[PDB]
């Protein structure tokens, strides 16, 4: 065999990642994501078929860090299957240029995330819940990409680093019960505090 897709949800609370810098830590957000990046690459190292999905949680949004949303992948959209006939990024690959194909696109977009420190929306914290389904629609399309002798093994990673936000409790619970329909594993590493609600998930 199957395709073995991965989904990764990373907590990026710049309030808390700023607070990660307030202790002047020996582990920062720069040190965080790079592990998570190669973690995403580690997925790819098991099989050429392996596919990744990465989305952090900005205070105003959750943009698809991976695959992309800009003119480096708005016209590229990956090399294997439905090719863009694009030469330079479509040229170099094999375990190391695929990652710098995706290394760039996270650090450029977290740059777009970490340039928006202008929050006035009354501490709009970790918006996990709506951020979850952003994968789930996309993999539904990716289910409809090819399925013909192609079992979609999706696997969802959730990463927690900060506290949960004050979001709608129903809209917390439901998508998990929708993921209960969806038959896809969800795994969770937290850093700072425990989430009784998300461990119920």
């Amino acid at each position: 065999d199957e395709l073995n897709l991965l989904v990764i949800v990373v907590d990026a609370n710049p309030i808390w990642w700023g607070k990660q810098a307030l202790k002047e830590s020996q582990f920062t957000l720069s040190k965080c994501i790079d592990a998570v990046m190669v973690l995403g690459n580690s997925h790819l190292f098991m099989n050429r078929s392996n596919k990744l999905a990465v989305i952090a949680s900005h205070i105003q949004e959750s943009r698809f860090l991976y695959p992309g949303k800009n003119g480096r992948l708005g016209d590229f959209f990956g090399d294997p299957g439905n090719p863009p006939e694009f030469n330079p990024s479509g040229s170099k690959d094999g375990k190391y240029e695929l990652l710098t194909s995706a290394n760039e696109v996270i650090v450029e977009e977290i740059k777009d995330l970490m340039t928006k420190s202008d929050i006035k929306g009354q501490h709009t914290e970790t918006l996990l819940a709506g951020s979850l389904a952003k994968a789930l629609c996309y993999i539904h399309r990716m289910n409809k990409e090819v399925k013909d002798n192609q079992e979609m093994k999706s696997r969802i990673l959730v990463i927690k680093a900060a506290e949960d936000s004050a979001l709608q409790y129903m809209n917390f619970m439901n998508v998990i019960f929708a993921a209960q329909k969806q038959n896809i594993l969800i795994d969770a590493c937290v850093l700072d505090s425990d989430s009784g609600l998300l461990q119920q998930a």
Binding site: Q60, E61, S62, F64, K69, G74, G121, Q122, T124, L127, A129, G130, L132, A133, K134, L136, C137, Y138, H140, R141, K144, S165, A166, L167, Q168, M170, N171, M173, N174, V175, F177, A178, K181, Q182, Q200
Partner: protein, 385 residues
């Protein structure tokens, strides 16, 4: 005459736009044949904790093929799916599998929520002769006397699978209107490929909804129409009390392995004939047995397990709708707000409030699987107050 006339039916069908592009628009009409009734929902009021009653006509009407090798094969197979998709949507309820066969009524599976018991019953119901004629009066008799002992704080609805035959039963079932109208029990039948006026009068005197089976796809539709807990008649109840919150038990809490098995005919719980090691715990009996998010037999209250069943309908009501536009406001870079693609089959799906752009595969994924627009999230919770 007819040797021509048998093939005058083919003359037009086969022929189309000739020269070039032949057998093309015939395929277009087949796509134009599609796109049947979507939702037409938007309701309020009632629908909570149903107490359904499967009633099955077992008759000689089953021997006609008409959709499948048997009309039970049309029926019984998708009931399991109807069972599972019910327990998917509505776990706060329970269903009485009652079978009419040979002018009587057998309550086959009791009013309960244990799916395997209900499904294997249907798997037992495979090799049914369906000998004899339907009798609804025996079916309503069980339906009365069982639901008579149910509280008036219970949703009282009956789902009858009738094979459209003669309602072969005495004893003034026309007078069972005032019996059951007073008893506040709803009765819903759907006819198998035909109509029974008396039963059609029955349901229109009920408030239960009657239909006729058209096709196997259409058979699914009305099942799906009756998956949802419907807004039945007013003045049923308000509340339902002593919803027992349980405990999971790990049986490793303080005394590690002090009990070889937590079912030895004396322990509080251990209800069903099988061995157990301690997984569960009810408040009122303090009943420890095999885990069940329903109810018990000694405390007799409702074993509510909130994340499952107090969550299911808890977002099944508060929905809104989208809109469709064929236009090109190119929001994104000709993208989707959800899955982020494009085909442009002129169905640019815009939310009513947050007004975000979606596709069919994003609309369906909401309107069948997600049940809400997450574009309202980031848009509701940030100014929420």
């Amino acid at each position: 005459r007819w040797e021509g006339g048998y093939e005058r039916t083919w003359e037009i069908l086969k022929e189309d736009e000739s020269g070039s592009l032949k057998a093309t628009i015939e395929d277009i009409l087949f796509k134009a044949k599609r796109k049947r009734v979507f939702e037409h929902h938007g309701q309020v009021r009632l629908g909570m904790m149903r107490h359904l009653y499967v009633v099955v006509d077992g008759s000689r009407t089953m021997e006609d093929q008409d959709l499948k090798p048997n009309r039970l094969t049309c029926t019984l197979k998708l009931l399991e799916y109807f069972v599972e998709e019910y327990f998917d949507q509505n776990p706060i309820s329970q269903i009485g599998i009652i079978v009419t066969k040979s002018k009587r009524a057998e309550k086959l599976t009791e009013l309960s929520g244990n799916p395997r018991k209900h499904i294997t019953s249907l798997k037992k119901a495979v090799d049914m002769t369906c000998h004899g004629e339907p009798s609804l009066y025996n079916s309503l008799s069980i339906a009365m006397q069982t639901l008579k002992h149910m509280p008036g704080h219970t949703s009282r609805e009956v789902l009858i699978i009738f094979s459209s035959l003669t309602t072969c039963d005495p004893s003034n079932i026309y007078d069972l209107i005032k019996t059951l109208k007073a008893a506040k029990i709803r009765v819903s039948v759907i006819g198998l490929s035909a109509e029974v006026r008396v039963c059609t009068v029955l349901a229109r005197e009920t408030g239960g909804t009657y239909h006729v089976i058209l096709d196997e796809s259409h058979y699914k539709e009305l099942l799906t129409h009756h998956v949802s807990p419907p807004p039945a008649s007013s003045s049923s109840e308000c509340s339902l009390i002593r919803m027992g919150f349980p405990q999971h038990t790990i049986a490793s809490l303080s005394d590690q392995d002090a009990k070889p098995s937590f079912s030895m005919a004396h322990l509080d719980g251990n209800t069903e004939p099988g061995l157990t090691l301690g997984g569960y715990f009810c408040p009122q009996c303090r009943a420890k047995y095999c885990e069940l998010p329903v109810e018990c037999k000694i405390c007799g209250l409702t074993l509510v397990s909130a994340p499952h069943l107090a969550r299911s309908y808890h977002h099944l009501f508060p929905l809104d709708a989208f809109q469709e536009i064929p236009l090109e406001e190119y929001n994104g870079e000709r993208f989707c707000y959800g899955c982020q693609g494009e085909l442009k089959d002129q169905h640019v799906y815009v939310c009513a409030v947050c007004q975000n752009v979606f596709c069919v595969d994003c609309d369906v994924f909401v309107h069948d699987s997600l049940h809400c627009c997450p574009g309202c999230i980031h848009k509701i919770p940030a100014p929420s107050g």
